[PDB]
Structure 1
Amino acid sequence: AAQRGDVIAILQQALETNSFRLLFQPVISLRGDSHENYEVLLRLLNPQGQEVPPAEFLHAAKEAGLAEKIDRWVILNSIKLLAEHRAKGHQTKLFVHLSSASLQDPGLLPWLGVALKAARLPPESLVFQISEADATSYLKQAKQLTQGLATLHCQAAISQFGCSLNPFNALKHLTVQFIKIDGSFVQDLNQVENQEILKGLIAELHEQQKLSIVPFVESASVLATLWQAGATYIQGYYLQGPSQAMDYDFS
């Protein structure tokens, strides 16, 4: 403490030394399956110990075009970690992020079509999370992707939802099961109007048989508010923050 580094170099390095640190943050059910649901996050270690800020290294990956490759790393390890977990008696789902790069590249889903069945990973055991931004920007390719995943018995999820001018139009074309509401709706919950906004959103999503995930549950009070709002899924530090191990007791 404290220091710096060539993050692009460290990225290209960690792709080989496999220095990448995989984290998990549980997604809790309120109205959905029992199951076990983790969102997998990616943290990176600098050569001298401390971890580099995720915004910084995520941008590094995009500046070097590395994006998709990094995704393919995660997607790999996750599956392995899943084969170690699903074949341990727990039936769990993983929420894995996809970058715009991975979204656009057509070779992704074929490449994936050699990795799962290499570990005999159960159907509907994997959820690919793409931002609403990347969803709207590259819509066609998103549609194609999600339909492919549908054929491969995987599930789609859209994060940071509810920000685009007409957030729902985007839905009409792609095959998505989970919708993860943007944290902006969870802002200023002490006011009733906001709660009503949230409830309206989640209800609209429920008419469309989508599974509402709401992040940032930071107190029991907030959990209450979100249950009242009708969120079918829920995620927060008060439940459990990002951790090294898929440890969370779901009962």
Structure 2
Amino acid sequence: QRGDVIAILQQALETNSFRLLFQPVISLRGDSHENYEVLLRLLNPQGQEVPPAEFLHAAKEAGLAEKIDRWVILNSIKLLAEHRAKGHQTKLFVHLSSASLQDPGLLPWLGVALKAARLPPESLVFQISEADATSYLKQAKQLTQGLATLHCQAAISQFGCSLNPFNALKHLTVQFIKIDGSFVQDLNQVENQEILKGLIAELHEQQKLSIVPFVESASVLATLWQAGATYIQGYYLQGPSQAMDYDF
């Protein structure tokens, strides 16, 4: 039970052997939109099961990651056109890797891609880890302006771990801030409640829309109400499915 996972990814792109899942994002302060996060899984060569963490790790590798990011975008748009066509007012969050964020030719590739899609506006929100972009701050700035231009949105995920996390946002064009898992633990404790309240209040003072992930029970879901959260995500609401079939 083993294999070169690089080669497996390279030969998965070669053959379009991937799938996309959709994990809805749920509005606590109104949004007409159907928001889903796009997640990626690998269709395994027949016997082999590539463990997810090892898969994701491999797919961050420079020059594999760009190709992969592009497959997701491309196919994300393809499906997104099939879907909205149904009259559906839908919006997809897509991940971008560190590599992609660095890749000067991305906004170009994306423009041409989006034309061929005749894709509705403000339907794509691009998502960047706070680490990738606290690091590549200038490339993230170029990219998020670039993205406004195309009538696209942008989000920082895993927000609030870094030193002074509000600083990087003075420099970006992002509407959403998906808070880090670490803030959504042991919420039954006040200090953790309070910590999450303040974090969320400051994002609101900065006119960002907060997204709180990892809602794993009904209770936490209440605390996120009084905390001010704008959106939530998790398995208690819905897990990642092959279809954008959530009843909002």
Question: TM class by shorter-chain length?
Answer: over 0.9
Q: 1:51 Cα shift?
A: 4.5
What number of residue pairs does the alignment pair up? 248
SS in structure 2 opposite 1:21? Answer: strand
Gap change, CA 1:64 and 1:197, over 3 Å in 2: closer
Question: 1:43, 1:51 within 8 Å by CA — same for their partners in 2?
Answer: no
Gap change, CA 1:64 and 1:100, over 3 Å in 2: closer
Q: 1:49 Cα shift?
A: 5.1
Question: Which of 153, 159, 172 is matched with 1:161 structurally?
Answer: 159
Taking the aligned partners of 1:113 and 1:63, their CA distance within structure 2 comes to 24
Question: 1:24, 1:243 within 8 Å by CA — same for their partners in 2?
Answer: yes
Taking the aligned partners of 2:175 and 2:101, their CA distance within structure 1 comes to 17
Q: 1:33 Cα shift?
A: 1.3
Question: 1:212, 1:231 within 8 Å by CA — same for their partners in 2?
Answer: yes
Question: 1:44, 1:51 within 8 Å by CA — same for their partners in 2?
Answer: no
Q: 1:55 Cα shift?
A: 1.9
Question: 2:157, 2:180 within 8 Å by CA — same for their partners in 1?
Answer: yes
Q: List aligned pairs for 1:142-157, cutoff 5 A.
A: 142-157=140-155
Residues 181-202 of structure 1 show CA distances to partners (whole Å, capped at 9, x for unaligned) of 0010001111011101101000
Residues 177-235 of structure 1 show CA distances to partners (whole Å, capped at 9, x for unaligned) of 00000010001111011101101000000011000000011111111011111100000
Gap change, CA 1:54 and 1:151, over 3 Å in 2: same
Q: 1:98 Cα shift?
A: 0.2
Q: 1:60 Cα shift?
A: 1.5
Taking the aligned partners of 1:248 and 1:67, their CA distance within structure 2 comes to 29
Give me the TM-score of the superposition, normalised by structure 1. Answer: 0.96
Gap change, CA 1:107 and 1:64, over 3 Å in 2: closer
Question: 2:35, 2:92 within 8 Å by CA — same for their partners in 1?
Answer: yes
Give me the TM-score of the superposition, normalised by structure 2. Answer: 0.97
- Higher alpha-carbon deviation: 39-48 or 150-159: 39-48
Long gaps (5+) in structure 1: none
The sequence identity of aligned pairs, in percent, is 100
Question: 1:37, 1:95 within 8 Å by CA — same for their partners in 2?
Answer: yes
Gap change, CA 1:219 and 1:50, over 3 Å in 2: farther
Q: 1:166 Cα shift?
A: 0.2
Q: 1:37 Cα shift?
A: 0.5
